[PDB]
Amino acid sequence: HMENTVFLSNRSQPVRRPKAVALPENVKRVEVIAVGRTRIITPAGETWDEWFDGNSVSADFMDNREQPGM
Amino acid sequence: HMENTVFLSNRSQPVRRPKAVALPENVKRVEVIAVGRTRIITPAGETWDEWFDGNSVSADFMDNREQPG
Amino acid sequence: HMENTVFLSNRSQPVRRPKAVALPENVKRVEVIAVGRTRIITPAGETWDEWFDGNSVSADFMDNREQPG
Amino acid sequence: HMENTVFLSNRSQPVRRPKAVALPENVKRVEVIAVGRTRIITPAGETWDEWFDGNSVSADFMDNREQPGM
Amino acid sequence: MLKFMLDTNICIFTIKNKPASVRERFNLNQGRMCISSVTLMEVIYGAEKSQMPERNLAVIEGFVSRIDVLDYDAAAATHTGQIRAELALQGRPVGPFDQMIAGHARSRGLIIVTNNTREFERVGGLRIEDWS
Amino acid sequence: MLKFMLDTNICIFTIKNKPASVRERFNLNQGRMCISSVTLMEVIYGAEKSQMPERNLAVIEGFVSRIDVLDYDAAAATHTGQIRAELALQGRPVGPFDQMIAGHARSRGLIIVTNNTREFERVGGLRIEDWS
Amino acid sequence: MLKFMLDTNICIFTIKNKPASVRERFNLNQGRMCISSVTLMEVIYGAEKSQMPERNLAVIEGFVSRIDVLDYDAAAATHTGQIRAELALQGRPVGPFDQMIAGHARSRGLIIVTNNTREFERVGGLRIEDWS
Amino acid sequence: MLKFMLDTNICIFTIKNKPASVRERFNLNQGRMCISSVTLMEVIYGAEKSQMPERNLAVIEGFVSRIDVLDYDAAAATHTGQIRAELALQGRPVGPFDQMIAGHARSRGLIIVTNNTREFERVGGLRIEDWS
């Protein structure tokens, strides 16, 4: 897939989304999530769509909570 | 995590990361990947197989570790 | 550590501690002790013997710890 | 010995040295050292007098440095 | 700007089953949601106890990185100690981690978000919502 | 800097019996000792369930005012989640609050001081001392 | 969050032989691994003493650019000073750089990954894995 | 505003023997002095290895709390790796901790303050003072 280059602006450090993978003009403001070295750019109010639609736990995950008292 | 907004810069469309979500400053290039209406930005050339298959070291890289003892 | 200066306050002579040297905010009283031209300020009533010799708990303070198991 | 009371000033948290243990008028500015819950108030340029004149290590402290190569 | 504290049960429910009803709530209430550090230890446990930890850990991180994690502080500790006593011989059982979640929520004035109110209904002075 | 995290069992033991053997260790290591917020929740509960809550609470507050209390944070929760799985997959039980105290210390590299060494020895990567 | 601190021995082993067994662990735990600045000093030395410093240095810099490097701080130094005494008073030797790596991990609660388990097992309160 | 980095030898010399000549230098140069984290591990070791650790630790703290402690960072790690090579087969020996102190000093442009120049005289590009 296409790449890009970082830069500095107002003391922070953005990235120019290429013309090929620009966001819809509808997305005026963004929620940015940090996971490891990657960062997820979600339109405001669509923050969880990547996580729900994306990768998932293994089916054994935790069938029991294992809190005492039971 | 932290919110922000989009700009129209270097004749394109970029977005900031406040320090709370800013990347290591040593990341000079990034891969941008499109998933739905969402974009994923990751450090370019981070994958391990790329380094495991690439340039080797010369054979003289340890005549000893030279830890005293 | 951090430097500062003296003032003439509440009709006496006090001195600040920038956050780097500021005390826990729960310290309501302090002992001031004079050593040479130097003053030592310590939380009042911190010593352990004072609490070890003081008020006891009632005998019912543990019928059990009530950790589940 | 005499006690005192803390207070707030310019967002920090000082203490009014009593009249009985005030510093010499010579001490216009101070170095403050934090050790545990106590804090040492030294006149500027006399910062180390408390530590040198004060308490000392046990005589066995470290007769050898025990760095390798020797 | 916070309003809701997600208990542990709603998290497993979401992380294991990813219900579409929840993604609408999470997108809408994004920025107002948090978990207690107590809840975090439980989902980390689920990952580490699983057959595929590194995988499940990665989806935990993606989830947790979208919400604030609150340290279980002295305020939470006092309120939980209070809540344990209000229940101890004066009422009905609640499990230990849920006791810490309850008092932590009360300590900050947050609404408990849960899929199982049956236990949290026993805690005094705490507002509860069912998001399942 | 801090060095010891006192377990809940040793705290109750000290608050109840105030033994001189522990007084020596307290005077000797004063300033280097802490408790988990989990431990604070337990003793506040012990106070609130007593017949003289305000009195016993006041001797609790005097004890706590002489030590730092550490908030149970994401690092403590993460290590605790690890410990729960590391113990599960070896079948060695440890009580829920003790798991959380164990992970809090390990997250910071602290030494646990406890009189219940047989259980805390079940936790990997943690240093134990008995001051009783 | 981080979980593993790679020892110097395993790094040299991996840089030299690039084994698939370690490649699996690297792909599986990518993002959770770090090295001590002490380890960085050792491999840079290994590079600079080679007959092709710039070349070998460049494969070093590619390896480091894929992991976080942690500065050896007051916490790491404090734990290392403890370890040196804890080992001295049991007579079990560990090499100087390995002591510093050991203390850095313990100061953070990290798991040491090494192929020299017999020495790192001599350190108290530290978790060891062999990825070779 | 920093100028001098105290090596380990000057510290032991001062902490053990408290020379009056040094208290004048320390008072005069107060604010411009630091140690490397490597030096900190050594004096912590001396305390922990001693017959009276808690005591010696307390005088260490009083000393260290009056100076800045610098983390041994990647810049120190590269310079030390360089220095080790400049010496390795091309010169005369230097002990491992002193190698780290030397490169750390060079990494920040600080003057080494020592009572024994005999080893540090072998390092290129480093300014040295004798304060004994």
Numbering used by the authors:
A (entry chain B), D (entry chain B): 0, 1G, 2 to 69
B (entry chain D), C (entry chain D): 0 to 68
E (entry chain A), F (entry chain C), G (entry chain C), H (entry chain A): 1 to 132
Authors' text:
VapBC TA systems are the most common Type II TA system in bacteria, and consist of a VapB antitoxin and VapC PIN domain-containing toxin. The VapB antitoxin consists of two domains, an N-terminal promoter-binding domain and a C-terminal, intrinsically disordered region, which conceals and inhibits the active site of the VapC toxin in the VapBC complex. Like many Type II TA systems, vapBC expression is auto-regulated at the transcriptional level through direct binding of the higher-order TA complex to two operator sites (OS1 and OS2) in its promoter. The related vapBC locus on the chromosomally integrated Escherichia coli F plasmid is mutated in bacteria that are tolerant to beta-lactam antibiotics, before subsequently evolving resistance.
